[PDB]
């Protein structure tokens, strides 16, 4: 949800929305900073 | 109700971020 409201034209996400997506991954999944960055690779290709 | 559940929404984001950079 947060992605998709946050996303402006699929795959082009700025710098403030990823570590946001990044540290509500981390804390709700409760990851390392590893696990947030593939997750959020993954959910940006998939915005796009 | 509805704007202020918006402008809560901009100010939860605020805190996150604020505690973030602590």
Not at chain 1, 32 to 41: G, K, W, Y
Not at chain 2, 12 to 22: C, F
């Given at each position: 949800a947060f992605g998709h409201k946050y996303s402006e034209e699929g795959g082009l996400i700025n710098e403030s929305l990823r570590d946001q997506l990044l540290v509500t991954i981390q804390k709700t999944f409760t990851?390392?900073?590893?696990?947030?960055?593939?997750?959020?690779?993954i959910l940006m290709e998939?915005?796009? | 109700?509805?704007?202020v559940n918006e402008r809560?929404?901009?100010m939860?984001?605020?805190?996150?971020?604020?505690?973030?950079?602590?």
């Open positions: 990851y390392t900073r590893t696990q947030a960055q593939h997750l959020f690779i998939c915005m796009k | 109700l509805e704007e809560e929404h901009s939860k984001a605020s805190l996150q971020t604020v505690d973030i950079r602590l």
